[PDB]
Design a protein around this ligand. Structure first.
Ligand SMILES: Nc1ncnc2c1ncn2[C@@H]1O[C@H](COP(=O)(O)O)[C@@H](O)[C@H]1O
Ligand SMILES: [Mg+2]
Ligand SMILES: [Mg+2]
Length: 328
């Protein structure tokens, strides 16, 4: 058994993959080469903040004719629209008109204009994203953005999608033990080694920490762990903090009763979308939504440092920072 890792700056963040394998090292190296090539290629497909991505091209055709996309992107959009509908739009993959207004706020610390923001909100109806795919052999997959000026932003689901694609790639290379970490979006594949095989111990950060040390760790196998939070990306102006997760009803950063939500799911795509929806919805409505998805678990960290975890994971949680308390 040998342990490997590799990390690079790609898709706007640090992406790291750790593998344990008994295969020849040259086979592991080849798999990791392909992981990082995939991440480069997919940055060019999915990115909402590059002018030259496939998504940018799709957005440039809003209000016009349907656009041919590859089956991968079509599938991701289908899943995004599914979580949009299930979450009552709390997760909304067509929020680009609003996100881009706040985004420039980040760069130069300024809050969007009232009427400008109001206008942007009229161009975020995800029910106007029409996906069509014929049923005959080799029929193309198309996307049409019906509403003029609407803009897709898949920031709340793309890391999950890519983590799932990487797991599929690792498995294709006959690997079965890995920790995939895309800017904190984790997939724990199989079991690690201590030969003693053990669950991966996935850390969850103090929402207000310097990010160094985890506050809690959860032991998992074959599971994604994806966290959304109110302090991973924000700017401040005149004593007010404006974070990156938007409430689509208000067009402002969500005012919510949790500091972070972590979703545990067999598919990272699903964990990523649900984490964002749940953050926007807040605790009680999240619990209601999650009743719909029995195969997922959740861990909520509240502003008062209480932690609540669903029945499927609560016994797997260990508190490392004693300021936090796990309710049982
Ligand atoms: N309510 C929302 N639904 C979907 N995407 C959002 C929403 N608010 C912001 N976004 C975009 O998705 C990112 C949040 O994803 P996450 O960190 O996974 O919660 C933001 O940085 C925006 O790019
Ligand atoms: Mg998300
Ligand atoms: Mg995310």
């Amino acid at each position: 058994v040998r342990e490997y890792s590799r990390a690079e700056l790609v898709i706007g963040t640090l992406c790291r993959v750790r593998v344990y394998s008994k295969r020849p090292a040259a086979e592991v190296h080849a798999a990791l080469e392909e992981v990082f090539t995939l991440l480069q290629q997919q940055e060019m497909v999915l990115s909402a903040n590059r002018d030259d991505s496939a998504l940018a091209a799709l957005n440039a055709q809003a209000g016009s004719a349907p656009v041919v996309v590859d089956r991968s992107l079509y599938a991701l959009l289908e899943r995004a629209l599914f979580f949009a509908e299930k979450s009552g739009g709390a997760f909304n993959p067509a929020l680009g008109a609003v996100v881009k207004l706040w985004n420039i706020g980040f760069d130069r610390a300024a809050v969007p204009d009232p009427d400008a923001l109001k206008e942007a909100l009229t161009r975020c109806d995800f029910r106007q994203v029409h996906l069509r795919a014929g049923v005959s052999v080799g029929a193309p997959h198309t996307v049409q953005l019906a509403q003029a000026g609407m803009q897709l932003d898949l920031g709340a689901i793309a890391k999950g999608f890519l983590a799932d694609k990487i797991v599929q790639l690792l498995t294709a290379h006959a690997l079965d033990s890995a920790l995939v970490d895309l800017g904190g979006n984790i997939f724990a594949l199989g079991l690690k080694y201590g030969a003693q095989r053990l669950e991966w111990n996935v850390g969850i950060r103090d929402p207000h920490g310097t990010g160094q040390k985890p506050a809690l760790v959860v032991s998992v196998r074959d599971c994604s762990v994806v966290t959304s939070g109110a302090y991973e990306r924000f700017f401040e102006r005149d004593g007010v903090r404006y974070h990156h997760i938007i409430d689509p009803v208000t067009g402002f950063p969500a005012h919510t009763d949790v500091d972070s939500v972590s979703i545990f799911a067999p598919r990272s795509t699903d964990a990523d979308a649900l984490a964002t929806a749940c953050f926007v919805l807040g605790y009680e409505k999240s619990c209601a939504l999650l009743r719909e998805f029995p195969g997922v678990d959740a861990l909520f960290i509240f502003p008062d440092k209480r932690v609540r975890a669903s029945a499927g994971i609560v016994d797997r949680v260990r508190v490392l920072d004693a300021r936090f308390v796990l309710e049982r």
